């Protein structure tokens, strides 16, 4: 139950890998979605991929 | 044999009608859909399918 | 370290809930027009049920 922007989502930091799985990277603002999660954890660098 | 006749017509059209639904190892069986949510240099190999 | 962020979502065609901002659009009846009724791009007549 929000708007969620990804004008605001741009980059940031120097994002290695801004992967995405079915979905265009570049579309997702118009796209609308249902029951988003959001994740959070460190991994060492040579585990990126 | 004159009821036969309708019988198998009407079976072929609707097999061939229900076909539609078939996936064919895509993400989704509506066009809209895949060229919605995927950039055309991906999208590609969907449509081609 | 690497600070990872992966998103999940489920589309399939459920009710939406969050997605962005889109601007809303009036109620035409009778017309062979577009429509985009919670991402689902067709045309065809809206006629009332």
């Given at each position: 139950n929000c708007v969620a922007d990804?004008?605001?989502?741009?980059?940031?930091?120097?994002?290695?890998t801004f992967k995405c799985y079915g979905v265009s990277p570049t579309k997702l603002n118009d796209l609308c979605f249902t029951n988003v999660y959001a994740d959070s954890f460190v991994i060492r660098g040579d585990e990126v991929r | 044999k004159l009821q036969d006749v309708v019988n198998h017509n009407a079976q072929a059209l609707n097999t061939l009608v229900k076909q539609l639904s078939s996936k064919f190892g895509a993400i989704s069986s509506v066009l809209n859909d895949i060229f919605s949510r995927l950039d055309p240099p991906e999208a590609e190999v969907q449509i081609d399918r | 370290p690497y600070r990872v962020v992966v998103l999940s979502f489920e589309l399939l065609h459920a009710p939406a809930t969050v997605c962005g901002p889109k601007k809303s659009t009036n109620l035409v009846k009778n017309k062979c027009v577009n429509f985009n009724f919670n991402g689902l791009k067709g045309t065809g007549v809206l006629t009332e049920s």
């Amino acid at each position: 139950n929000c708007v969620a922007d990804y004008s605001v989502l741009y980059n940031l930091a120097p994002f290695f890998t801004f992967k995405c799985y079915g979905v265009s990277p570049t579309k997702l603002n118009d796209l609308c979605f249902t029951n988003v999660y959001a994740d959070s954890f460190v991994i060492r660098g040579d585990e990126v991929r | 044999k004159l009821q036969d006749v309708v019988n198998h017509n009407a079976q072929a059209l609707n097999t061939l009608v229900k076909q539609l639904s078939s996936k064919f190892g895509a993400i989704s069986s509506v066009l809209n859909d895949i060229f919605s949510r995927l950039d055309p240099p991906e999208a590609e190999v969907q449509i081609d399918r | 370290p690497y600070r990872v962020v992966v998103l999940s979502f489920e589309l399939l065609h459920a009710p939406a809930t969050v997605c962005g901002p889109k601007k809303s659009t009036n109620l035409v009846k009778n017309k062979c027009v577009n429509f985009n009724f919670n991402g689902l791009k067709g045309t065809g007549v809206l006629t009332e049920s």
